């Protein structure tokens, strides 16, 4: 059936005051059957974070492809790729497979290391950039996520508060989606440090 | 003048000559003699076959191209195999697509054009064989001489190969007699067999030596060798 | 989407709404649908969003190279010719529907391009799900020889018709003005008539509300 | 139709020299002087317009070229080789960079691509090396201002200041004497003018000299307003009149 | 072939011309409504079949070509002209104008002087016919050079042929009928055979004329040929 | 679409309506359907707008290159280039074209290239969805060697009827007059032609 | 449908694979070993489309053996599975995809740990304490969610496996003809020849 | 590509001859690190020392090269080596073992030796790297496509002289710091210049990562070279 | 005979001999040409020599109409000339098709110079032994003259001349623009700009011309056309009634 519904999975990113957060569930399924309780969907190239939902094979492939491409970038440029630039790199990489696309909903989070400005972005499977400053959502519970985020969100949140907001958005969206959940990981990203937390959630 | 100019087929000499092509012509003169001649009703090829050894087979000079066409060779034999294969295909193509027997004149043109490409391409050599082509088409009997320069001429009779100048002079003299030899295959073969004799320092042409081919009004192209030529020696 | 193009006496104006959708859901409440092909040739697209952006950047890139190569200002007929030939080759599969407007040394120009590669010229155009609402406004108020002021007003009013009546369109109005003498003026959020009202309540959570299983610092360096 | 020289035309000689590259470098030597000087807040690249005929309109032949909004190039050697290298450099900035990351390449990487293009003319079958040396100056957010020389072999080196062509040895000497790390752009332009007068035979004015800078952003050259994060090219070709103004207080 | 000499010449092409000069003589004559082509066929031996080693070639239905030098090279060129004429007719529906056709051959011959891996053609070609706006006659050298002509000659007897041609242009400035031009071509071919008088020759004439052949290329044969031979035989003595 | 070309005493005239639709929506009410491919060779397009424009652009390119090398192409040559493109690509094209031209030799000529890619030389031609309604009228009213004004009247009357019955036709009637004169653009508004 | 189970205990990985080969209405064979050894400490089991299954397995086996001889070294289980996933990920977008699901069980000598990877035909890879391909997982995952402990011995794991095969024999609609059981640990790969009545 | 009557490859030998005129590069391996040092080719006051890297290049996070020969040829090869390391990382999810990368590059050079009528690359490499199989490693490759492993090596000018010096002072139980001293002394003894100053050097280490258990490539900034040149008593 | 004299590789002096030899080929026709800018036109004049009385004079030409707006005069052997003409025509038609506007004179010249550069760098191609002079009234730049050579060099000119006696004409013109101080000919009619061109050729070459000795091309806004013998005759009469 629908390739974007086979495996499950949700990713949400949010901006706050001088920070960003990015979160995902841990489920890997095969239709009704839950297979893995440990499938992380967030990755990081230097200080740039990328979540991917959709077909898990493509999640894996794109992670490996962007690790590849950012490694080369760093060697040639002699510096780590920035959120803005990487967003462009994901976009043109996806559009390159316009008529045989990866079945994914990527999400980019990070802080520009020069300007210190928090940055998030989203894409469709063919690399159309969703440039929004507050939140980005993706996956089989994107409707539930849009609802939670539009309700819960306010701008300029302290990292410790933004943590609660993004967590509550993720948990409650996941619980209304049969194919999401099974654990969750949340990243709080502050210029200087990055904290990773595994949430306690319903295991049904 | 002959110095730096005979390196390939892609270079003119200061005299306007193509030496590679002239050298290819020299492989013909090295080859064993073959004669061709015709009347209005038949065309005949006579060839002197050459052995390597007294323990060996004499090598064939005559190749069939279609039921109404065939050729004799003088020069590089494997080049004749290449060109007759092409001619066999051109004949075949004509039958299949057009249900038409290839005019001997068109066969001439096709061979000329094929030879020509090899007198102008770098890294390729010209063909090193001379051919005499006979046939009976919709306008009677025909004989053609082919030179690897690509020049093809229609003739009542001719000869190519070593000492062929003798046979040629004979046919040049015999003209008004053999052009009329109509409805008698055996007499025309006899006149051909006599022509090839003027080109002998060798020996007396044996049952193995001699190769005869005929084509005409009601005779498919046929090759005679061995015991079947005895009655002409 | 509602996009319009309106010619006035000394140039051309394009405008667009700022809503992108995924089916019935609004993903971006304030995105830019106005795109630069070159400094004075601008572009609005409807249809497959990734396609209209990509086709804009590809042709934009080539127009720059052409300009550098020829030592001339890019013409609107060049953008149009390259776009249509490219879209035609792809036999509608690149779902780009575009209003292309600009000024060049030969004057001012307004064109529409359809995804199969057909083009039209005109003094006023609309594209998108909101094009009928906008066209009804344009057909009601357009006149020959408009001032800059009048043209901005009309284009803006066309976008509002799209915003208020078409469910595919919403939020704000962006405008770009291309006048024959001048630099082009991009006017982000020229109108903002859709400010979200203040919520009744704040939903910030008391800290500690979320149950955490484990925790760790993540290494960014090397 | 079809190439018979599918082998390298540049080969090693018994002594280790790459003959064709040396001979190309000799072609650069015969060429009109060009130079580059790097300041704290800019780069200047300069050269003489040695006109072929007084009936020719020398404004129709630019020796100083924009490669990206923040990168310009100049050369010494064979003009027509430069002209085609400029086209390929412009193209490769788009195809290998802008169409990937949505921004223009940093100076070193673009110079790197040009160098690659020149290297290939040194190894490929049936070609001769390019007969030019380029000076390429540019700016980028993370590296600041820079200046590079690219040679016929594909070698490139960063410079604080240098000169190529005819009187390059005397000019490098003149530059080593005058350069320091506190130079403002106007000081660099001044030094570039002085250095170039030694080289120039005939008239020395804004019509016979060609000069460009990589300076600050020119929002008046952008062509549009309304996007605050877009500020305009740093590459700027000085006008004839702007040059004459600096020759009066020279 | 691609080599320029220190003074801007191409020795290879100059050598290709020597092959042409070595060839049999051939001519073309432009009349008031068409063109006549004639050629000297050397009779090497009595064994050569009369009337059966045709040198003059048709291209499409309205163009004739004659040439001197390496005969196979000329055939190679004519094959190309035929492909070139078919392709024009295919796209544009109308048969190829003679000047259009000239350039086709021209460009093709010139290409063979650009590359070290090819030799120039060893022929000069005289050709032409009738199109939408009249008769045209062209001559094409190994370098790819071609111009329109009033009369043209190439090969061994070119010098005397040119001199007889020049006389006609002088005594007939007022446009030389198709029927006269044929007669004169026979004459001129006879008068270039003086050089090669050691061997006998056969005369071939063809023509393309508006009033005489309806603008199609035809071979001169039968009574018309004999009449032209007799005129030439009478005027040689 | 209603399109036609008519030969007359002094040359040829092309006419068309100006309506383009997608479904029942008028995407363009003032389209110019009369397309120049050379100075005095014009055409009317019907079928897929993308296809017919792409074709007309290629023909214009071929005729410009033709003119550079060989001189003014005949109308027949133009029609042959259209056919080649339409015939050879019949399986990805929906294109019906009418070619109209003037040269000094052949005077005014009309060729029609319907869907299959066949070519037909005709004294006058009609095409587009609107033409079906005027076969009876045109056959009854067309005469050879009409004057300019008579021909202008014939096209005006014919297309006004085609417009009256065809929903896909309408707007203004445009015309191009092709003679030795001269190329002349004419236009007629609804208030004139509806009252006929 | 083809039973393919794996379980990772503390010091070994146990693979169990059904022995039936069924085409149409006939069991053609009841002793089919659905396995290839890739290297002395890596075993791969497979299930899926009839021809693809063995062809893919043997192709992979060839490639790992080639690596071993070129490098005189054995790739880690993680590396072998990454290579296997890549091949499958390329396959899914090709003209005719390999319809093969696999389990990879290896003993990593550098880490001294057993490792179990589950990869489906799309190239979906995951490292798991236990895994199954096909319908069999619909029974075994929940059973092992209950019975499995991370500190089990090889003998405890073989009992846990016996329990899985009993359930499948009880509930599965198809006669899969028992299993061939293979243990991968530090001393390599061995077959438990007694399982059909142990 | 052709053989001489002697059984030698002309073009390869001439490429090697070219390399002996390039600035010396030295590689030394110790038990806890590797040193790479190279002499910059006769420079000028106006050269930008800070943004210059002509002899030392990063191949991945664990492998670096020192170059002797044409720089533009070397960038060609370095780029493919970088790609090769990333393909391996993508395939196996492991960093490429040093020998595998070295063999590949060497095979590319060998190809130009055997077919295609193109000139060889005028490049010799010293590879310095770490992996979990052989620890610290040093390889060398030249235009012939041959490669060998070493504890200490040089390429470019004066290899013969530099090799004898290394043979004398090298000992298996060295720490990196002693190896740093050895490389600089050897370059000092073998220069064709008056003194071996900072502006004429490139220098790098591969160590056990300051304090961690991980591996770190330090490419020395010009100022760092100036310091490490005083420490070792060459000033 | 070293390889550096047979193909386009560098000599030890950094020269390319085959390029230099190609320049020498340009004079082999012994024809002179000159181009001048009017106020709203551009004029090319070239000698026309028809030595053989068997030639059709109308077919002997070194001026080509590249497009509706661009004319080209060539100095060099006709076969190479026609090669360049064909290419320029194709390049011009293609530019219009792809970019939707007429190819400017200078851009066509840049493109032909680019092609010539290639023959300078690749071994299997010889340079063409011709100098191309392009003229038009550019819609953006006004009257234009651009000239390309076998080196791939090109520039724009106020006026220019080419051929064996190029220098005579060049200095004649240099002397005129020294006097006038402007960079074109003041004159509204192309007919008087053509007369100026013929007149100055006559002084510089010190030769008289009949109507069959000359060849004339004129570029105006949107046409480029050549003159027939009769239009040239009319021009020769006008000069004679004064000069
Ligand atoms: Mg969703
Ligand atoms: Mg759930
Ligand atoms: Mg002659
Ligand atoms: Mg209607
Ligand atoms: Mg060349
Ligand atoms: Mg060559």
Swiss-Prot record, chain A:
Subcellular location: Cytoplasm; Nucleus
SUPFAM superfamilies tied to this protein: N-terminal nucleophile aminohydrolases (Ntn hydrolases)
Residues bearing PTM Phosphoserine: 30
Keyword Phosphoprotein: yes
Gene Ontology molecular function, alphabetical: endopeptidase activator activity
Biological-process GO terms, alphabetical: proteasomal ubiquitin-independent protein catabolic process; proteasome-mediated ubiquitin-dependent protein catabolic process
Signal peptide stretch: none
Cross-link (Glycyl lysine isopeptide (Lys-Gly) (interchain with G-Cter in ubiquitin)): 69
InterPro entries the UniProt entry points to: Ntn_hydrolases_N, Proteasome_beta_3, Proteasome_bsu_CS, Proteasome_sua/b, Proteasome_suB-type
Annotated GO CC locations: cytosol; nucleus; proteasome complex; proteasome core complex, beta-subunit complex
Gene3D superfamilies: Glutamine Phosphoribosylpyrophosphate, subunit 1, domain 1
CDD domains the UniProt entry points to: proteasome_beta_type_3
A matching Pfam family: Proteasome
Organism superkingdom: Eukaryota
Keywords tagged on the record: Cytoplasm, Isopeptide bond, Nucleus, Phosphoprotein, Proteasome, Ubl conjugation
Reported function: Non-catalytic component of the proteasome which degrades poly-ubiquitinated proteins in the cytoplasm and in the nucleus. It is essential for the regulated turnover of proteins and for the removal of misfolded proteins. The proteasome is a multicatalytic proteinase complex that is characterized by its ability to cleave peptides with Arg, Phe, Tyr, Leu, and Glu adjacent to the leaving group at neutral or slightly basic pH. It has an ATP-dependent proteolytic activity. This subunit may participate in the trypsin-like activity of the enzyme complex.
Family of the protein in this entry: Belongs to the peptidase T1B family.
Protein name: Proteasome subunit beta type-3
Swiss-Prot record, chain B:
Protein family per UniProt: Belongs to the peptidase T1A family.
Misc. comment: Present with 7210 molecules/cell in log phase SD medium.
Residue numbers of Phosphoserine PTMs: 13
InterPro entries: Ntn_hydrolases_N (IPR029055), Proteasome_alpha (IPR050115), Proteasome_alpha-type (IPR023332), Proteasome_asu_N (IPR000426), Proteasome_sua/b (IPR001353)
Keywords from the UniProt entry: Cytoplasm, Isopeptide bond, Nucleus, Phosphoprotein, Proteasome, Ubl conjugation
Statement: the UniProt record of this protein carries the keyword Protein transport: no
Cross-link (Glycyl lysine isopeptide (Lys-Gly) (interchain with G-Cter in ubiquitin)): 190
Protein name: Proteasome subunit alpha type-6
GO CC annotations, alphabetized: nucleus; proteasome complex; proteasome core complex, alpha-subunit complex; proteasome storage granule
Principal location listed in the UniProt entry: cytoplasm
Superkingdom in the source lineage: Eukaryota
Pfam families: Proteasome (PF00227), Proteasome_A_N (PF10584)
Organism this protein belongs to: Saccharomyces cerevisiae (strain ATCC 204508 / S288c)
PANTHER family xrefs: PROTEASOME SUBUNIT ALPHA/BETA
Location within or outside the cell: Cytoplasm; Nucleus
Record-level GO BP terms: proteasomal ubiquitin-independent protein catabolic process; proteasome-mediated ubiquitin-dependent protein catabolic process
Function of the protein: The proteasome degrades poly-ubiquitinated proteins in the cytoplasm and in the nucleus. It is essential for the regulated turnover of proteins and for the removal of misfolded proteins. The proteasome is a multicatalytic proteinase complex that is characterized by its ability to cleave peptides with Arg, Phe, Tyr, Leu, and Glu adjacent to the leaving group at neutral or slightly basic pH. It has an ATP-dependent proteolytic activity.
Swiss-Prot record, chain H:
GO biological process, one term: proteasome-mediated ubiquitin-dependent protein catabolic process
SMART domains (alphabetical): Proteasome_A_N
Sites of the Glycyl lysine isopeptide (Lys-Gly) (interchain with G-Cter in ubiquitin) crosslink: 90, 189, 221
Compartments it resides in: Cytoplasm; Nucleus
Coiled-coil positions: none
Alphabetical UniProt keywords: Cytoplasm, Isopeptide bond, Nucleus, Proteasome, Ubl conjugation
Gene Ontology CC annotation, any one: cytosol
Principal location: cytoplasm
PANTHER family in the record: PROTEASOME SUBUNIT ALPHA/BETA
Misc note: Present with 17100 molecules/cell in log phase SD medium.
Cited function: The proteasome degrades poly-ubiquitinated proteins in the cytoplasm and in the nucleus. It is essential for the regulated turnover of proteins and for the removal of misfolded proteins. The proteasome is a multicatalytic proteinase complex that is characterized by its ability to cleave peptides with Arg, Phe, Tyr, Leu, and Glu adjacent to the leaving group at neutral or slightly basic pH. It has an ATP-dependent proteolytic activity.
Subunit relationships: The 26S proteasome consists of a 20S proteasome core and two 19S regulatory subunits. The 20S proteasome core is composed of 28 subunits that are arranged in four stacked rings, resulting in a barrel-shaped structure. The two end rings are each formed by seven alpha subunits, and the two central rings are each formed by seven beta subunits. The catalytic chamber with the active sites is on the inside of the barrel.
Name this protein carries in UniProt: Proteasome subunit alpha type-3
UniProtKB/Swiss-Prot annotation, chain I:
Gene Ontology CC, one term: mitochondrion
Pfam families membership: Proteasome, Proteasome_A_N
InterPro entries cross-referenced by the UniProt entry: Ntn_hydrolases_N, Proteasome_alpha, Proteasome_alpha-type, Proteasome_asu_N, Proteasome_sua/b, Proteasome_subunit_alpha6
Phosphoserine modified-residue sites: 228
Coiled-coil regions, chain positions: none
Gene Ontology biological process terms in this record: proteasomal ubiquitin-independent protein catabolic process; proteasome-mediated ubiquitin-dependent protein catabolic process
Keyword terms of this UniProt record: Acetylation, Cytoplasm, Isopeptide bond, Nucleus, Phosphoprotein, Proteasome, Ubl conjugation
Function as written in the Swiss-Prot or TrEMBL entry: The proteasome degrades poly-ubiquitinated proteins in the cytoplasm and in the nucleus. It is essential for the regulated turnover of proteins and for the removal of misfolded proteins. The proteasome is a multicatalytic proteinase complex that is characterized by its ability to cleave peptides with Arg, Phe, Tyr, Leu, and Glu adjacent to the leaving group at neutral or slightly basic pH. It has an ATP-dependent proteolytic activity.
Designated name of the protein: Proteasome subunit alpha type-1
Species the sequence originates in: Saccharomyces cerevisiae (strain ATCC 204508 / S288c)
Taxonomic lineage of the native organism: Eukaryota, Fungi, Dikarya, Ascomycota, Saccharomycotina
Gene this protein is translated from: SCL1
């Amino acid at each position: 059936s629908d390739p974007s519904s086979i495996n499950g999975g949700i990713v949400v990113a949010m901006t706050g005051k001088d920070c960003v957060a990015i979160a995902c569930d841990l489920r890997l399924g095969s239709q009704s059957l839950g297979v893995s309780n440990k499938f992380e969907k967030i990755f990081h190239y230097g200080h740039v974070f990328l979540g991917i939902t959709g077909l898990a094979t493509d999640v894996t492939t794109l992670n490996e492809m962007f690790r590849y491409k950012t490694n080369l970038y760093k060697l040639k440029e002699e510096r780590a790729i920035e959120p803005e630039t990487f967003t462009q790199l994901v976009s043109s990489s996806l559009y390159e497979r316009r008529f045989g696309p990866y079945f994914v909903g990527p999400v980019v989070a990070g802080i520009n290391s020069k300007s210190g400005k928090p940055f998030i972005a989203g894409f469709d499977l063919i690399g159309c950039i969703d440039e929004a400053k507050d939140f980005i959502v993706s996956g089989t519970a994107s409707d539930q996520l849009f609802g939670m985020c539009e309700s819960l969100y306010e701008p300029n949140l302290e990292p410790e508060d933004l943590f609660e907001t993004i967590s509550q958005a993720l948990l409650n969206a996941a619980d209304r989606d049969a194919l999401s959940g099974w654990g969750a990981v949340v990243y709080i990203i502050k210029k200087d440090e990055v904290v990773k937390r595994y949430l306690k959630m319903r295991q049904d | 003048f002959r110095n730096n100019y005979d390196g390939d087929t892609v270079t003119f000499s200061p005299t306007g000559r193509l030496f590679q092509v002239e050298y290819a012509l020299e492989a013909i003169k090295q080859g064993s003699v073959t004669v061709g001649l015709r009347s209005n009703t038949h065309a005949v090829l006579v060839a002197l076959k050459r052995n390597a050894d007294e323990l060996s087979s004499y090598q064939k000079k005559i190749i069939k191209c279609d039921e109404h066409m065939g050729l004799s060779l003088a020069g590089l034999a494997p080049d004749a195999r290449v060109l007759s294969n092409y001619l066999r295909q051109q004949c075949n193509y004509s039958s299949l697509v057009f249900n038409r027997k290839l005019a001997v004149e068109r066969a001439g043109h096709l061979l000329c054009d094929k030879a020509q490409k090899n007198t102008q391409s770098y890294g390729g050599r010209p063909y090193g064989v001379g051919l005499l082509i006979i046939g009976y088409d919709k306008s009677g009997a025909h004989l053609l001489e082919f030179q690897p320069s690509g020049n093809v001429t229609e003739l009542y009779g001719t000869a190519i190969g070593a000492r062929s100048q003798g046979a040629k002079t004979y046919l040049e003299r015999t003209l008004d007699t053999f052009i009329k030899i109509d409805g008698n295959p055996d007499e025309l073969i006899k006149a051909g067999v006599e022509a090839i004799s003027q080109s002998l320092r060798d020996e007396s042409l044996t049952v193995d030596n001699l190769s005869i081919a005929i084509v005409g009004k009601d005779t498919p192209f046929t090759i005679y060798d061995g015991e079947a030529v005895a009655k002409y020696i | 989407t509602t996009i319009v193009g309106v010619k006035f006496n000394n140039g051309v104006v394009i405008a667009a709404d700022t809503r992108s959708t995924q089916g019935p859901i609004v993903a971006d409440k304030n995105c830019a649908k106005l795109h630069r092909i070159s400094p004075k040739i601008w572009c609005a697209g409807a249809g497959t969003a990734a396609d209209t952006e990509a086709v804009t950047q590809l042709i934009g890139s080539n127009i720059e190279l052409h300009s550098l190569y020829t030592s001339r200002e890019p013409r609107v007929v060049s953008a149009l010719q390259m776009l249509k030939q490219h879209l035609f080759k792809y036999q509608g599969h690149i779902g780009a529907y575009l209003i292309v407007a600009g000024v060049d040394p030969t004057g001012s120009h307004l064109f529409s391009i359809h995804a199969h590669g057909s083009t039209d010229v005109g003094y006023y155009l609309s594209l998108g799900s909101g094009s009928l609402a906008a066209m009804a406004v344009l057909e009601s108020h357009w006149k020959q020889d408009l001032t800059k002021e009048e043209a901005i007003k009309l284009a803006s009013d066309a976008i509002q018709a799209g915003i208020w009546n078409d469910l595919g369109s919403g939020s704000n109005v962006d405008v770009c003005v291309m006048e024959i003498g001048k630099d082009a003026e991009y006017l982000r959020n020229y109108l903002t008539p859709n400010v979200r009202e203040e919520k009744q309540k704040s939903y910030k959570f008391p800290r500690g509300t979320t149950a955490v299983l484990k925790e760790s610092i993540v290494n960014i360096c090397d | 139709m079809t190439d018979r020289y599918s082998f390298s035309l540049t080969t090693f000689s018994p002594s280790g020299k790459l003959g064709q590259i040396d001979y190309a470098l000799t072609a650069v030597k015969q060429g009109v002087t060009s130079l580059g000087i790097k300041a704290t807040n800019g780069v200047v690249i300069a050269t003489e317009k040695k006109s072929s005929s007084p009936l020719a309109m020398s404004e129709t032949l630019s020796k100083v070229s924009l490669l990206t909004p923040d990168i310009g190039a100049v050369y010494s050697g064979m003009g027509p080789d430069y002209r085609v290298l400029v086209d390929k450099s412009r193209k490769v900035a788009h195809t290998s960079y802008k169409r990937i990351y949505g921004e223009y390449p940093p100076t070193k990487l673009l110079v790197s691509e040009v160098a690659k293009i020149m290297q290939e003319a040194t190894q490929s079958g049936g070609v001769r090396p390019f007969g030019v040396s380029l000076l390429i100056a540019g700016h980028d957010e993370f590296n600041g201002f820079s200046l590079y020389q690219v040679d016929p072999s594909g070698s490139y080196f960063p410079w604080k200041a240098t000169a190529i062509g005819k009187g390059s040895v005397a000019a490098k000497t003149f530059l080593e004497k005058r350069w320091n790390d506190e130079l403002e752009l106007e000081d660099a332009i001044h030094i570039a003018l002085l250095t170039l007068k030694e080289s120039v035979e005939g008239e020395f004015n804004g019509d016979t000299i060609e000069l460009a800078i990589i300076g600050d952003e020119n929002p008046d050259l952008l062509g549009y307003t309304g996007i605050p994060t877009d500020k305009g090219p740093r590459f700027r070709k000085l006008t004839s009149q702007e040059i004459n103004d600096r020759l009066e207080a020279l | 072939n691609s080599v320029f000499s220190p003074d801007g010449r191409n020795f290879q092409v100059e050598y290709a011309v020597k092959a042409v000069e070595n060839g049999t003589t051939s001519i073309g004559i432009k009349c008031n409504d068409g063109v006549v082509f004639a050629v000297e066929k050397l009779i090497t031996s009595k064994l050569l079949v009369p009337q059966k080693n045709v040198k003059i070639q048709v291209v499409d239905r309205h163009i004739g070509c004659v040439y001197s030098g390496l005969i196979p090279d000329g055939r190679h060129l004519v094959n190309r002209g035929r492909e070139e004429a078919a392709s024009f007719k295919k796209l544009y529906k109308t048969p190829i104008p003679i000047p259009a056709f000239a350039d086709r051959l021209g460009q093709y011959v010139q290409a063979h002087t650009l590359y070290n891996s090819v030799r120039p053609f060893g022929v000069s070609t005289i050709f032409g016919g009738v199109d939408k706006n009249g008769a045209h006659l062209y001559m094409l050298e190994p370098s790819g050079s071609y111009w329109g002509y009033k009369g043209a000659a190439t090969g061994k007897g070119r010098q005397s042929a040119k001199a007889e041609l020049e006389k006609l242009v002088d005594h007939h400035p007022e446009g030389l009928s198709a029927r006269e031009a044929v007669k004169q071509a026979a004459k001129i071919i006879y008068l270039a055979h003086e050089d090669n008088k050691e061997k006998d020759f056969e005369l071939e004439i063809s023509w393309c004329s508006l009033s005489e052949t309806n603008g199609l290329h035809k071979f001169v044969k039968g009574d018309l040929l004999q009449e032209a031979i007799d005129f030439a035989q009478k005027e040689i003595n | 679409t209603s399109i036609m070309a008519v030969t007359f005493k002094d040359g040829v005239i092309l006419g068309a309506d100006s309506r383009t639709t997608t479904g029942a929506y008028i995407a363009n009410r003032v389209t110019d359907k009369l397309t120049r491919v050379h100075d005095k060779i014009w055409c009317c397009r019907s079928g897929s707008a993308a296809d017919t424009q792409a074709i007309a652009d290629i023909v214009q390119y071929h005729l410009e290159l033709y003119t550079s090398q060989y001189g003014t192409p005949s109308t027949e040559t133009a029609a042959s280039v259209f056919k080649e493109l339409c015939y050879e690509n019949k399986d990805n094209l929906t294109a019906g074209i009418i070619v109209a031209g003037y040269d000094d030799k052949n005077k005014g000529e009309v060729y029609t290239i319907p869907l299959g890619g066949s070519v037909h030389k005709l004294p006058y031609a009609i095409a587009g969805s609107g033409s079906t309604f005027i076969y009876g009228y045109c056959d009854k009213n067309f005469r050879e060697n009409m004057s300019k004004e008579e021909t202008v009247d014939f096209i005006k009357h014919s297309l006004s009827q085609a417009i009256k019955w065809d929903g896909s036709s309408g707007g203004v009637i445009r015309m191009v007059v092709l003679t030795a004169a001269g190329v002349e653009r004419l236009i007629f508004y609804p208030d004139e032609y509806e009252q006929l | 449908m083809d039973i393919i189970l794996g379980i990772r205990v503390q010091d070994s990985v146990i693979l169990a694979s059904s022995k039936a080969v069924t085409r149409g209405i006939s069991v053609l064979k009841d002793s089919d070993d659905k396995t290839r050894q890739l290297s002395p400490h890596t075993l791969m089991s497979f299930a899926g489309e009839a021809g693809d299954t063995v062809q893919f397995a043997e192709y992979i086996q060839a490639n790992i053996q080639l690596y071993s001889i070129r490098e005189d070294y054995e790739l880690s289980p993680q590396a072998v599975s990454s290579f296997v996933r890549q091949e499958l990920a390329k396959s899914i977008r090709s003209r005719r995809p390999y319809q093969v699901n696999v389990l990879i069980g290896g003993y990593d000598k550098k880490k001294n740990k057993p490792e179990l990877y589950q990869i489906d035909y799309l190239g979906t890879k995951v490292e798991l304490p236990y895994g199954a391909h096909g319908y069999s997982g619909f029974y075994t995952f929940s059973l092992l969610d209950h019975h499995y402990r991370p500190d089990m011995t090889t003998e405890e794991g073989l009992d846990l496996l016996k329990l899985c095969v009993q359930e499948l024999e009880k509930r599965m609609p198809m006669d899969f003809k028992g299993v061939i059981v293979k243990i991968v640990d530090k001393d390599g790969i061995r077959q438990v020849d007694d399982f059909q009545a142990q | 590509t052709i053989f001489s009557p002697e059984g030698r490859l002309y073009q390869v030998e001439y490429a090697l001859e070219s390399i002996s005129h390039a600035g010396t590069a030295i590689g030394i391996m110790a038990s806890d690190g590797i040193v790479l040092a190279a002499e910059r080719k006769v420079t000028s006051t106006l050269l930008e020392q800070d943004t210059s890297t002509e002899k030392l290049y990063k191949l991945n996070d664990k492998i670096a090269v020192a170059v002797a020969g044409l720089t533009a040829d070397a960038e060609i090869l370095i780029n493919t080596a970088r790609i090769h390391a990333q393909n391996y990382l993508k395939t196996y999810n492991e960093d490429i073992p040093v020998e595998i990368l070295v063999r590949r590059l060497s095979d590319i050079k060998q190809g130009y030796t055997q077919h295609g009528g193109l000139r060889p690359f005028g490049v010799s490499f010293i590879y310095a790297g770490y992996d979990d199989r052989y620890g610290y490693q040093l390889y060398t490759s030249n235009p012939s496509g041959n490669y060998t492993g070493w504890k200490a090596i040089s390429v470019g000018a004066n290899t013969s002289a530099a090799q004898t010096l290394l043979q004398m002072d090298y000992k298996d139980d060295m720490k990196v710091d002693d190896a740093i001293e050895l490389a600089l002394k050897t370059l000092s003894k073998t220069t064709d210049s008056s003194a071996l100053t900072y502006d004429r050097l490139e220098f790098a280490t591969i160590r056990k990562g300051a304090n961690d258990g991980e591996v770190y490539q330090k490419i020395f900034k010009p100022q760092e070279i100036k310091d490490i040149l005083v420490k070792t008593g060459i000033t | 005979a070293g390889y550096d004299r047979h193909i386009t590789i560098f000599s030890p002096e950094g020269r390319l001999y085959q390029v230099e030899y190609a320049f020498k080929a340009t004079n082999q026709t012994n024809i002179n040409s000159l181009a001048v800018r009017g106020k709203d036109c551009t004029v090319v004049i070239s000698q026309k020599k028809v030595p053989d009385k068997l030639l059709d004079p109308t077919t002997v030409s070194y001026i080509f109409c590249i497009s509706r707006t661009i004319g080209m005069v060539v100095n060099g052997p006709i076969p190479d000339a026609r090669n360049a003409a064909l290419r320029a025509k194709a390049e011009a038609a293609e530019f219009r098709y792809k970019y939707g506007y007429d190819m400017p004179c200078d851009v066509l010249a840049k493109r032909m110079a680019n092609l010539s550069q290639i023959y300078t760098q690749r071994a299997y191609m010889r340079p063409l032994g011709v100098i191309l002079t392009f003229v038009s009234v550019d819609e953006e730049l006004g009257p234009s003259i651009y000239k390309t050579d076998p080196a791939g060099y090109y520039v724009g000119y106020k006026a220019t001349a080419t051929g064996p006696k190029q220098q005579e004409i060049t200095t004649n013109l240099e002397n005129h623009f020294k006097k006038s101080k402007i960079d074109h000919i003041n004159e509204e009619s192309w007919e008087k700009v053509v007369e100026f061109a013929i007149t100055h050729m006559i002084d510089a070459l010190g030769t008289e011309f009949s109507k069959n000795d000359l060849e004339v091309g004129v570029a105006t806004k949107d046409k480029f056309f050549t003159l027939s013998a009769e239009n040239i005759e009319e021009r020769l009469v006008a000069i004679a009634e004064q000069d």
